[PDB]
Amino acid sequence: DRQKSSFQTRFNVHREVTPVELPNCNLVKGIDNGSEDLEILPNGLAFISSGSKYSGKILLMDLNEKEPAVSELEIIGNTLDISSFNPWGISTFIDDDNTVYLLVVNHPGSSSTVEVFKFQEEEKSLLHLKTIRHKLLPSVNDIVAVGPEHFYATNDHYFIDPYLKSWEMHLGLAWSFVTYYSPNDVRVVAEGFDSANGINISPDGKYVYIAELLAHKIHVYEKHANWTLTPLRVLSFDTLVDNISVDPVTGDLWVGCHPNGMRIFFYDAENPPGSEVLRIQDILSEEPKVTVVYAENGTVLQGSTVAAVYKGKLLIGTVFHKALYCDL
Ligand SMILES: [Ca+2]
Ligand SMILES: [Ca+2]
């Protein structure tokens, strides 16, 4: 039927990547079970979620170092069950007092939560503050924090039940939605997505970017002062856009992508998924500039999900494999 060709475009079933090489890339020692999301503070500290599964941890890298090493951040507190910790998307928020909050999408079992931590820098540890859950956060993929416990969140499925959501994805229902959460108000701000994944915000707070993974699109929304979102632009791509990072200096989007959906969603060690990184400049203009900055067939890095730049270097994460650190 027609649902056979649509599945095949959605999952990019025969796409092969055109490699783009970077001359000094090195695998990050210590990252072998995923680096699904990451975020770099202005001071050069990078948080990385790992062990994402569908043992989990949050890693730290000081990118001001010449050969930065990963350390595992210890979770401090008695309000979180560490043994089920299964981190996915992350976000940070830095308050007036310079407190660094880390928000972490957690999937303990088949439920979704958002965990709030306070970064304790001197101790290199995470103080757990709060577990957030809500009817309108059924299947969280990523969030972008706009306060210590305020965020926009993507739900990449409508259903929670793993069997139902498997079906919803194969059918292409496109029922995934985006939710604004705050202590005072929780509501849906956009809906109808074919798997909303990455989400982020312009440095001036005026725009929100949402990755629609299986539609291969990035949506730009106007963010009003009352936290409402209104559609503004839709950019289309030939690749499965996953997590979005934002360079604070330029506002550029840096995007980790899966060139082929079959190889990322139906794993096969003899045919691993590759990696692909997009830079997007001037997203509001008539012709946004889209550059493939890095791409490979997975011989080195399999299943890139996220990429961000700090002072000439590019850090690339993956859903379940390694992480790559490159000169631009
Ligand atoms: Ca994120
Ligand atoms: Ca993902």
**Residues 6 or more apart whose Cβ sits within 8 Å of residue 214:** 10, 11, 169, 172, 194, 195, 240, 261
Residues 140 and 105 sit within 8 Å (Cβ to Cβ): yes
Q: Could you tell me if residue 168 is left (phi over 0), alpha (psi between -120 and 50 degrees) or otherwise beta?
A: alpha
Residues 171 and 164 sit within 8 Å (Cβ to Cβ): no
Residues 35 and 48 sit within 8 Å (Cβ to Cβ): yes
CA atoms within 13 A on the CB side of 179: 24
* Two structure tokens written together for 87: 């981190």
Pick the closest to residue 85 from 53, 59, 60 (CA basis). Answer: 53
* Two structure tokens written together for 126: 């995470």
Ligand nearest, relative to CA of residue 244: 1
Query: How many angstroms is it from 122 CA to the middle of ligand 2?
Result: 30
Query: How many angstroms is it from 145 CA to the middle of ligand 1?
Result: 9
Query: How many angstroms is it from 99 CA to the middle of ligand 1?
Result: 19
Query: How many angstroms is it from 43 CA to the middle of ligand 2?
Result: 26
Residues 199 and 211 sit within 8 Å (Cβ to Cβ): yes
Distance CA 214, CA 242 (A): 9
Query: How many angstroms is it from 232 CA to the middle of ligand 2?
Result: 24
* Two structure tokens written together for 62: 């000081």
**Domains assigned to the chain:** 1-328 (2.120.10.30)
Distance CA 238, CA 216 (A): 6
* Two structure tokens written together for 158: 């409508």
First-residue to last-residue Cα distance in the chain? 45
Residue 277 burial (C-beta neighbours within 10 Å; 0-12, 13-18, 19+): buried
Query: How many angstroms is it from 25 CA to the middle of ligand 1?
Result: 23
Tracing tokens 């299986």 back to the chain, one arrives at 214
